[model samples]
Target: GQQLNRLLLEWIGAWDPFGLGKDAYDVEAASVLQAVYETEDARTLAARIQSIYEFAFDEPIPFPHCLKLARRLLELKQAAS
Candidate 1:
């Protein structure tokens, strides 16, 4: 478990460009918690996440614009998800 934690931490560090700790910017956990409190169902939560992505990429936008728009949409969706 210790070694797994270390490896996970290293992997997270490699992916995190902002240098915040693993949980500092954890959207997935926050999304799940919000969804649980809001809808009280795992399936609904998954559906909401899927809906956000669906709405986000449903239309074609430029790459840079898409990234920004998608992130914003994800946050909004996560809150409502």
Candidate 2:
């Protein structure tokens, strides 16, 4: 995985909705990071995260919650830059 993706995993894992242990959200983080890299629009990235969580958990999370995480990830990416 990319360094940024791994870093994102750390942040995602901290949320740990499923309580699946340390690396539980690693794959999800990677998927979200790919979407972040692919999209220039925050709305698109937020939607992608929303969908990812829905499929990942077999249930949907709030869009604004996904948007918050997306914003955090975007900010982290910017800080990295």
Candidate 3:
């Protein structure tokens, strides 16, 4: 899939730690990608991603889990160099 959203879902599905184990959710990859440019700090991105998780799951996810995903994204972003 050339679209970022599809790719986003691919990673999200592969590394879903919060039981995002079904096809019942939708998130904006555009904004998620923006986070990569918007902030390099993992902690800041963690909070941002955590908020996304909360909203995505109707306020049903812990911060650390979101941090885990944030960490992955950060590494992928920074390690691209």
Candidate 4:
């Protein structure tokens, strides 16, 4: 459950960096839900996370913040697992 919470929190942080209050999934939750509903695997989750980051990072949207958040999440996952 703790790991799942971390995954969800990471997703939330990626999707809505500003409005989610540091722990709200919001649309990111829906995105992850759709992915998990289709394939229940960590690989799928990671892929979805990558996809979200790609979508966000590829845009004119602030890359530094997204990069920092993504790196932090990746580090967290690595350390946790």
lDDT of each: 0.41, 0.79, 0.64, 0.53
Question: How would you encode candidate 3's per-residue C-alpha lDDT over 1-81 as one tens digit per residue?
Answer: 345445555665565555656353445344556675688887898788767666666675677776787787777666554
**What tens digits encode model 2's per-residue C-alpha lDDT throughout 1-81?**
378767877886676666778677777877887898887667888999889888989988888888887788888888777
TM-scores of the candidates are 0.29, 0.81, 0.67, 0.43
Candidate 3 TM-score to native: 0.67
Q: If both were scored by lDDT, which would come out higher, candidate 3 or candidate 4?
A: 3
Off by over 4 Å in 3: 1-9, 17-28
Candidate 4 residue lDDT tens string, 1-81: 566555746655556644536455455655644554454345545566557645644634345554554455555455655
lDDT of 1 by residue, 1-81 (tens): 245334333433333333555554345334433443465444454465454434533733234432443344345445543
Which consecutive 10 residues in model 4 have the weakest lDDT in total? 59-68
RMSD in Å for candidate 4, one decimal? 6.2
Best by lDDT: 2
The alpha-carbon RMSD values of the candidates against the true structure, listed in the order shown, are 11.9, 2.1, 3.3, 6.2
Using TM-score as the measure, the top candidate is 2
Candidate 2 structure, TM-score to reference: 0.81
Q: What is the full ranking by TM-score, best candidate first?
A: 2, 3, 4, 1
